[PDB]
Structure formats: structure tokens, C-alpha cells
Design a protein around this ligand. Structure first.
Ligand code: K
Ligand code: K
Ligand code: K
Ligand code: MG
Ligand code: MG
Ligand code: MG
Ligand code: MG
Ligand code: MG
Ligand code: MG
Ligand code: MG
Ligand code: MG
Ligand code: ZN
Lengths: 103, 132, 343, 77, 36, 16, 225
RNA sequence: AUAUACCGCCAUCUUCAGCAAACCCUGAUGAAGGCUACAAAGUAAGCGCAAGUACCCACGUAAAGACGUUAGGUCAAGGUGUAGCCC
């Protein structure tokens, strides 16, 4: 109901600190060059994949147009462009929700 | 190359006691004997029995005071008295050391049919002669 | 026979077989290895199968102000003790089994990119907590010896830095890989370069140099560009504190040549203040995001020249065909400008 | 109880320090440390008379922490 | 937490230089550093 | 190494 | 409260004067000329980095420009005096055995240190091992001869820079001054030249130590009252 | 069964004198290398040699003799990992 509160809580500060929620996430892939698209979705029929993306791995992070402090983490502060999904590692499902919430 | 009772050189991190650091050729030169009795003197008897008793007493005390012995046992025989002198650590509570002294002295006195006394010297840590 | 029994140390030294022609030259490999276990660890003096309770050894000596007598646990009461020791034994095995996973490097089996922590504190109460260490190369070097044949040593290359311009690198050599880590990281802290950074995020100008056969071309970039450089350069740049740079490595891709070639080029970069002092002119930065506003970044400390810099109609500067081919849209590569994780 | 020559006063301060350590490292430490009022007043006075003023000034905090009334003699010294 | 047991000072430090030594070692006994 | 490496005072007369 | 005034009246005050110790009165171009300081090696021995400091070649014998030596010597003596004033450890180094005894006596007389013997590998770069972890290294190394006996640079020149120690050095026409902090072009062979250098450095060092005591004493007397 | 899993105890060079942790420096911070005494980058704990001790001497003879080499010898001294047998 109030998604912006999670980012102001002590639980959030202990898990992420002042870095973005996607800072410590790493994609598992063969080769040095990753696939040009991230996985379609990390939640499939209510089951979570082994390496869920920064959004899907924390169920308290809610992609909502009012939780602007979370959305800012997926926009470049210097250029204002929205990071493509391989940049942060979010699945295609959550990247679309972020792009719509940002707009 | 000779191997018998020789702690081999390492990286300088292995602590050895005075006894362990001296190979067999130093026996009677730099280090003494760990058991003293008359069985190995010229014209004396019963060396075999004294030797078996010593091997048992060393194993018995190793397992009776597990992890407590900080050096080899010194076994002394005078007449029919058997004195066991052991250097032990200061980890076990004093009550347990008194129990095991009473238990060991009594059990060994009935086993070998002689008055047996156990003398414990405690050290805070194993005494290091050198680091090989 | 009681007299044929040995001590635990003797039994493990034999069973483990750590000394021998197998372990001399690594003639034997160990996918399955006997692991030493301390069998006296959870054992209490006085506790045996029969479950006797000896006053003063395994149970308290006095109970209710009176000396306890010899007693024996009931068959049921002893089964619980035995079961509890087995569970305590599996719990200990599980506590050791639960070991924190460490992050990987450039690849799962690669040492490159792995952090080794800060250099060790010096003898005179010196500390380097502000410095981070990264591995760049771990090699097995094989030396043919007069009497011992092929021997195996480790050569390590590590870089250190505090993220604020101070960084260095050193080679470490030892028979053991962890001693090489200590030598390299401790030596590197005494060979630190200072690297000047423009606005504490990028280099002051494009740097193109060759070290031996390794060519490195670096480009100054604006904020938000990130580190789009050879993975080794990315590792080093995080130690120096550069956030935004493009680099291309050509010719031989030799890690050592690349490391010292990179440090040579970054330590010989002229800052804007040096340019103003050298030429006695203002340095004016024009940013397209700020339009025509002239931003003076550096002014000469000494007198200011009155004669304009000569305007050569055409500069006699040498150009890189790769840079020109890109600006003309004639550069076609499926691998350029690919989407990658944040670096 | 009374002041003494400097040689004796120094010796009494080496013991008072050792007693202070006993109060600090009691085996009842699991329970709140009981620092009697007389003990705190005497230990502080012995430090002053010995010249270990630095140690005496530090101890004044323990009067407030444990809420123990300071003695008149200690305040005057 | 119970304090670890502290070994007492060697009782040699309580011996006077004009004592009756035969009372210290009355009969054959092993060498005792704390007593000699 | 990447799996993890986990090999993992006061004294008194007459203590209690 | 009282430390800032100390460091300001004693440590920072000398650094506000161009010649606080008046070391220019110790020498002149004539005094240097009489000591044969201008005499350099033959042109065939010339080092290319010493060409700036050479006046010319007189019949294939290089002549050192004493006008430059005078300015370089002024800087070197001024630095040396300031380091003695600050109670820095000054180490004299030379491998020329003709002057080993002279140099060792000059060091003892001024209250400083001399190393004129074979220089063992790592005296500076490995001092903690050789001397101990608390060993204090020199704050200034003065070379009266920058070359060893095989006509190569003294190892301490390279190792002094590694340890961030400033170096004063007499550099003849066959020497390399690149790594010497305060080079002084001058003759290092003639007994008259070397003797002159020892008098100047000995005097500069001794004067600075007496100046340090005078200021401290005055600063204390005024402090009480 | 496996000495080609080993402990233990040994052969061999050895009728040798070298090995070597921790540092330092050179080679552009390459694999590598590091001595000069009128000395030029090495310092080196520890082990060995040596010293000392045994025998009739300070002589000789013993004893000692590191690291490493030959997956040297020995599972049959004893112990023991692994595999195998259990009417
Ligand atoms: K063998
Ligand atoms: K066997
Ligand atoms: K077997
Ligand atoms: Mg032999
Ligand atoms: Mg993998
Ligand atoms: Mg000359
Ligand atoms: Mg074999
Ligand atoms: Mg002889
Ligand atoms: Mg022989
Ligand atoms: Mg010998
Ligand atoms: Mg074979
Ligand atoms: Zn997802």
C-alpha cells in the first residue's frame, strides 16, 4: 500500500545500504559476452528461478510510479536514460514494469 | 639416510621439546634415559619384565590422561617402589587430576603388586626447546 | 594385541600419506582425499559405553553437600546420551559443511579479479585498510632443475589501490600460491603510483601508447559512460578510482605488459593546470549540455600571455583509422556497443 | 583511614588498584557489579594521596553510574 | 563466566635463606621446581 | 577457496 | 595551544628567510677557484647531463663554470643547514679512499654520520631487517663522490631516491646528476677541492645546530617571563 | 592385492657441502639473476658440515651426515589407507 516506506526502513538499509538494489547482482551465463536479452521472467507460475533478478529476489520491492526512490535507481542520473535490462540484470518482465512506472 | 627417532627439519614452525630434538646418538651424551632400573646392569635379572611394564605404563598413562601429558614419562624404580613422574598441562580441573591420580595409583598398585606413586608437574604450555 | 596399538598421530600420518613420492612431485592427485579428523574432540574424560557416573570425573563430586557414590545410567538414559553424541557429531559436520561462498572472478575457475583484501600491516604499526587488492594473473611456472627435474612454482600479479588515485602493482613468486599472494600484495603497496583524475571520475585526455608489443588506446569519457575496457583494465580502474573510460587493447594481450603499460600511460597524463602553466593560457571547457557557456577549468598561476595561440589552419596530428572509421559510420562490428552488465 | 608517609601511601595505592581489579572482574559479573560506597570512596582517596590523580578523576564517573554517594573527605581532597 | 584457574606462586618465594631444608625434602622425591 | 575457507583471559586463585 | 607557537617561531620562521644561516659568506668564486673546483675530467669522460654545468674544454680538459657552482653550492649548503637545524640525520657517503679518513673525521666533528666503506646491498632499502624495525634512516645524504671505484654511480644514489631521501652531491664532469636532488658541479678529485667541501658542509652543519640551540634557549627564557 | 596410498626403519650419491624460510635489489616489474676485499646488491634465521662428545690424546677410528635423487627396499617386523575373502 505504501511501497516508498520500505526504502526508508532499517531492513532496507541493512540489505542494500546506499547502493542500488542491483549493485551486487550478477548474471550467470556462458562466455564473456552475456546474452543481449535478460531472462523473460524470474517468477514462473508462482515459482522463483534459482538466481532471481534484483526486483524478483526481494518481494518487498514494489515497482510503482509512486515509489520514485526505487525508480531512480534504474535511470542514469547524468543522462536521464533508462538502463537497458542487461545493465542491471532485471528480467524482461520487470524491466517493462519499471519502464512504464518511470514514464 | 637415518630415520630412527629423528624429527626432520621443516619451515621453522614445528615446536619440538628437548627430548624430541635429540636423535638416538645423543642418548647418554645430551639426553638421559626415560626409565631407570637395575635390570639392564651387568649381572642383573628381569630386564624383560621391567621393559614390558614400562611399555604398558606409558600407554596406560597416555590414555588415562588424554591430551594432558606435555612430555614423555619418567619412570623410576627404587626397591619395590615405582615412581611415575609426568609433566602435564593446566587445562583439566584440579578435581579431575586428583581423581585420576588416585585412580591410576590404586589400579597400578594392584596390577603390578607394588606401591606405585604418581608425581605430576603442571606447565601452562608445552615447553619448546626449538622450532624446527 | 594391546601392545600393537599406536597413537592417533601415528595412525593419521600413515593413513593420510602426505609424505612420499606421491606427494613429492604431486605424482598422486586427490579428487578423493583422506581428511584428518580429531577423534578426541567431543570426547569427555570418564564417559564410556557402560554409562557409569564417576564422582569427580564426569559428574559433580558433591551433590546436596554430600559426596556422590558410584552410579550407572539406565539403559534408556544411556541410549539418549549415545544418540545425542551422534546428533552433536552430525551438527559439527554440518557446521563445517556450512561455509560462506566467496564471489568469483572474471570466470568461475579464474583467479583474475578476485579480491585478496588489504595489504598486511607493516612492522611499525603501519596499516593499509584503505587499500584493496585484486589479482590480475596466477600462473604455474615450471622450472627444470639439475637434480629434481620439473618443479612447480607460482607467479602472481596483483594490483592494489585505495580508489582515490593511488594504485600500484607487483609480481609475487613462491612455491605456494598463498605465499605469492602475500609477497605481491605487500610489495605493491610500496610501489604506488599516483594517477590524476579529471573531476575524480575519468582521465584528463585521450591516452594512446605502446608498451613493448601491447598497444593501449584510452579515451576520456563523460559521467555515466562507465568502464568499457579490458576486464583487467576494469579491475585496475576501480582500484585507481576511474569510473568512466573507454579503452582498447591491441597487439599482444600480455597481462604484465598491459598492467605496466597501463600504469605508465596513466602516470604520464598532463592535467589541465599543467597545460595552463606550460602555455600560460586559460583552459576553457566547452560542453554541449551547457551550450556556448565557456567554463574556465584552469588558469596559469604565472603571468598570462597576451599573444593568441597560433591557429594552424590544418593540424599535423596523426589519426587512428579505427576512430575515424567509427565517426564515418564505416566501422561494422557485431561485437561493438553490445549490452553488458554495469561495470 | 588516615594519611601516611609517601612511601606507605604509594604501597596502599598498588593494593587498592589490585582490589579495584577484583571488584571489576568478580565472578558475579553476570549479576550487576555491587560496588559498595565505602569501597569507592576509599579507593579514590588512596589514588589522590598517592599522586595518581588521573586514576582518581576517571573513577568519579562510577559514583554516578552506580548512584553511590560521594564522601565529604573525597570531595575536599 | 568462571575464571580459569591461576597457578599459585612457587612456594620457593616464601622460603627463608636460613630455613631447615631437610624438612622440605625429607625423603627421596622427584625434582620439584616449585619446591627447590 | 571459492567454496570458502573455514578452519574455525582473567585468572583466579581458587576459581568457581 | 603552545605547540603551534613553538613550530611557528622555531620550525617555520627559518623557512621565511632567503639565507637564514648566511651560508653565502662561507665561499666565493675566488675561494672555489683557488681550491681547483673548476677542474673537470677530460672531454672523453664527459657525461652528457653534465654539459649544462660545463664552461668549456681547455685543451680537451673540461672546465666547470664556477658561476653555476656558486649558485648550486648556495642551494646545497642552505638545504643542508636547514636539515641540520631541524635535527635531521645527515649521512656522508664517498667511496674515494684517498679521503675516507678525512670524511669520517668531518662527520664525527660535526655530529653527523659517514659511510665511506663498501656499501652492502640493501642498507637503505632493507634497513629494518639489517638494523631493526625501529631504525631511523637518514634525512639527508651528502655525496662528496657520486661514483664508486668502478666508475659507476654509487648504489646509494638510486637507493636514496627509492627511500625518498634528498641527496646533496658533488658531481664532476663524468658523473650523472639526474637523481641527485641538490647537485653541485665541482672537482671531486683534487685534495684542495674535497677539503674545501668538508669545511663548508662541516661549518654549515655546525652553525645550524648552534642556531637551533640559541633560538630554543631564547624561546624558553621568554616563555617563563 | 597394492611399497605406484603410506607410517615405521633403511639403501644410494655421502670417500658430498650444501639446503633454505622471511626480506631486499637487477632485468622496462619477461622466463630469469643477484660475485669482485684496493670489493661492483645482497642480508639471511633455521638445518647440514663444523664444533662438541664416545674410544687410548688435540691424532685416528667411530658416530654424525641436511635438502634432494633412484614412485630405490620392505604391506611377510608391527601398524595402516584403498580394494578383496567371510562354510
Ligand atoms: K619408502
Ligand atoms: K606392513
Ligand atoms: K595393506
Ligand atoms: Mg648409513
Ligand atoms: Mg563454473
Ligand atoms: Mg672526478
Ligand atoms: Mg618406494
Ligand atoms: Mg678427532
Ligand atoms: Mg660410519
Ligand atoms: Mg660432525
Ligand atoms: Mg618401486
Ligand atoms: Zn526478475
Amino acid at each position: 500500500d505504501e511501497p516508498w516506506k520500505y526504502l526508508e526502513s532499517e531492513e532496507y538499509q541493512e540489505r542494500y545500504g546506499s547502493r542500488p538494489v542491483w549493485a551486487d547482482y550478477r548474471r550467470n551465463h556462458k562466455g564473456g559476452v552475456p546474452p543481449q536479452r535478460t531472462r523473460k521472467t524470474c517468477i514462473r507460475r508462482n515459482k522463483v528461478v534459482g538466481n532471481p533478478c534484483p526486483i524478483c529476489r526481494d518481494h518487498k520491492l514494489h515497482v510503482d510510479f509512486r515509489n520514485v526512490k526505487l525508480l531512480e535507481q534504474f535511470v542514469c542520473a547524468h543522462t536521464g536514460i533508462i538502463f537497458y535490462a542487461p545493465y542491471t540484470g532485471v528480467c524482461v518482465k520487470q524491466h517493462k514494469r519499471l519502464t512504464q512506472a518511470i514514464q | 639416510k637415518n630415520r630412527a627417532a629423528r624429527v626432520r627439519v621443516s619451515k621453522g614452525d614445528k615446536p619440538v621439546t628437548y627430548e624430541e630434538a635429540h636423535a638416538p646418538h645423543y642418548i647418554a651424551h645430551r639426553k638421559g634415559w626415560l626409565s631407570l632400573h637395575t635390570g639392564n646392569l651387568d649381572g642383573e635379572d628381569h630386564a624383560a619384565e621391567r621393559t614390558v611394564e614400562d611399555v604398558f605404563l606409558r600407554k596406560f598413562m597416555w590414555g588415562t590422561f588424554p591430551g594432558c601429558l606435555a612430555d614423555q614419562l619418567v619412570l623410576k624404580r627404587r626397591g619395590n617402589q615405582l615412581e611415575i613422574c609426568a609433566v602435564v598441562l593446566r587445562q583439566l580441573s584440579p578435581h579431575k587430576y586428583y581423581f585420576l591420580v588416585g585412580y591410576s595409583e590404586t589400579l597400578l598398585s594392584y596390577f603390578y603388586k607394588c606401591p606405585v606413586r604418581l608425581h605430576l608437574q603442571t606447565v601452562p604450555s608445552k615447553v619448546v626447546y626449538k622450532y624446527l | 594385541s594391546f601392545f600393537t596399538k599406536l597413537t592417533a598421530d601415528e595412525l593419521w600420518k600413515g593413513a593420510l600419506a602426505e609424505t612420499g613420492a606421491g606427494a613429492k612431485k604431486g605424482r598422486g592427485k586427490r579428487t578423493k582425499k583422506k581428511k584428518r579428523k580429531d577423534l578426541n574432540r567431543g570426547q569427555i574424560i570418564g564417559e564410556g559405553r557402560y554409562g557409569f557416573l564417576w564422582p569427580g570425573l564426569n559428574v559433580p563430586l558433591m551433590k546436596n553437600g554430600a559426596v556422590q557414590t558410584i552410579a550407572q545410567r539406565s539403559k534408556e538414559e544411556q541410549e539418549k546420551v549415545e544418540a545425542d553424541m551422534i546428533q552433536q557429531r552430525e551438527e559439527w559436520d554440518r557446521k563445517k559443511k556450512m561455509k560462506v561462498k566467496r564471489e568469483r572472478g572474471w570466470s568461475g575457475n579464474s583467479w583474475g579479479g578476485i579480491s585478496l583484501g588489504p595489504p598486511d600491516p607493516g612492522p611499525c604499526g603501519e596499516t593499509y585498510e584503505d587499500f584493496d587488492t585484486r589479482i590480475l594473473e596466477v600462473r604455474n611456472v615450471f622450472t627444470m632443475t639439475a637434480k629434481e627435474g620439473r618443479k612447480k612454482s607460482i607467479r602472481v600479479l596483483v594490483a592494489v589501490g585505495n580508489g582515490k588515485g593511488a594504485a600500484g602493482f607487483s609480481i609475487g613468486k613462491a612455491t605456494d600460491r598463498m605465499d605469492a599472494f602475500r609477497k605481491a600484495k605487500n610489495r605493491a603497496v610500496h610501489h604506488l603510483h599516483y594517477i590524476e583524475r579529471y573531476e575524480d571520475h575519468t582521465i584528463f585526455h585521450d591516452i594512446s601508447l605502446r608498451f613493448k608489443r601491447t598497444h593501449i588506446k584510452m579515451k576520456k569519457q563523460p559521467k555515466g559512460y562507465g568502464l568499457r575496457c579490458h576486464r583487467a583494465i576494469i579491475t585496475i580502474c576501480r582500484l585507481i578510482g576511474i569510473k568512466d573510460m573507454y579503452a582498447k587493447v591491441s597487439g599482444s594481450i600480455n597481462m604484465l605488459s598491459l598492467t605496466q603499460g597501463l600504469f605508465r600511460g596513466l602516470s604520464r597524463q598532463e592535467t589541465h593546470q599543467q597545460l595552463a602553466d606550460k602555455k600560460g593560457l586559460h583552459v576553457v571547457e566547452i560542453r554541449e549540455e551547457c551550450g556556448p557557456l565557456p567554463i574556465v577549468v584552469a588558469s596559469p598561476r604565472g603571468p598570462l600571455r597576451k599573444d593568441p595561440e597560433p591557429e594552424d589552419e590544418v593540424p599535423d596530428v596523426k589519426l587512428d583509422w579505427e576512430d575515424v572509421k567509427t565517426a564515418q559510420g564505416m566501422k561494422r562490428s557485431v561485437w561493438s556497443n553490445l549490452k553488458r552488465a554495469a561495470t | 583511614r588516615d594519611k601516611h608517609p609517601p612511601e606507605l601511601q604509594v604501597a596502599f595505592a598498588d593494593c587498592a588498584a589490585d582490589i579495584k581489579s577484583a571488584y571489576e572482574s568478580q565472578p558475579i559479573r553476570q549479576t550487576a557489579q555491587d560496588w559498595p560506597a565505602t569501597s569507592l570512596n576509599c579507593i579514590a582517596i588512596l589514588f589522590l594521596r598517592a599522586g595518581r590523580t588521573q586514576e582518581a578523576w576517571k573513577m568519579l564517573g562510577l559514583f554516578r553510574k552506580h548512584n553511590k554517594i560521594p564522601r565529604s573527605e573525597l570531595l575536599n581532597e | 563466566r568462571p575464571p580459569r584457574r591461576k597457578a599459585l606462586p612457587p612456594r620457593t618465594e616464601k622460603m627463608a635463606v636460613d630455613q631447615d631444608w631437610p624438612s622440605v625434602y625429607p625423603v627421596a622425591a622427584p625434582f620439584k621446581p616449585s619446591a627447590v | 577457496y571459492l567454496s570458502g575457507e573455514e578452519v574455525e583471559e582473567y585468572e583466579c586463585y581458587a576459581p568457581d | 595551544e603552545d605547540s603551534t607557537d613553538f613550530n611557528d617561531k622555531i620550525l617555520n620562521e627559518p623557512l621565511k628567510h632567503s639565507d637564514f644561516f648566511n651560508v653565502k659568506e662561507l665561499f666565493s668564486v675566488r675561494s672555489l677557484f683557488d681550491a681547483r673546483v673548476h677542474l673537470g675530467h677530460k672531454a672523453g669522460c664527459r657525461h652528457r647531463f653534465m654539459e649544462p654545468y660545463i664552461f668549456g674544454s681547455r685543451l680537451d680538459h673540461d672546465i666547470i663554470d664556477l658561476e653555476q657552482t656558486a649558485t648550486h653550492l648556495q642551494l646545497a649548503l642552505n638545504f643542508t643547514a636547514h636539515m641540520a637545524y631541524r635535527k635531521g640525520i645527515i649521512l656522508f657517503i664517498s667511496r674515494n679512499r684517498q679521503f675516507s679518513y678525512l670524511i669520517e673525521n668531518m662527520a664525527r666533528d660535526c655530529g653527523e654520520y659517514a659511510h665511506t666503506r663498501y656499501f652492502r646491498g640493501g642498507m637503505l632499502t632493507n634497513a629494518r631487517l639489517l638494523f631493526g624495525p625501529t631504525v631511523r634512516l637518514p634525512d639527508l645524504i651528502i655525496f662528496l663522490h657520486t661514483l664508486n671505484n668502478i666508475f659507476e654511480p654509487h648504489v646509494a644514489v638510486r637507493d636514496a631516491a627509492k627511500m625518498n631521501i634528498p641527496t646533496v652531491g658533488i658531481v664532476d664532469t663524468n658523473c650523472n646528476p639526474c637523481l641527485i636532488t641538490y647537485p653541485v658541479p665541482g672537482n671531486d678529485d683534487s685534495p684542495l677541492a674535497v677539503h674545501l667541501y668538508c669545511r663548508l658542509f662541516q661549518t654549515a652543519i655546525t652553525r645550524a645546530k648552534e642556531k637551533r640551540q640559541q633560538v630554543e634557549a631564547l624561546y624558553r627564557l621568554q616563555g617563563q617571563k
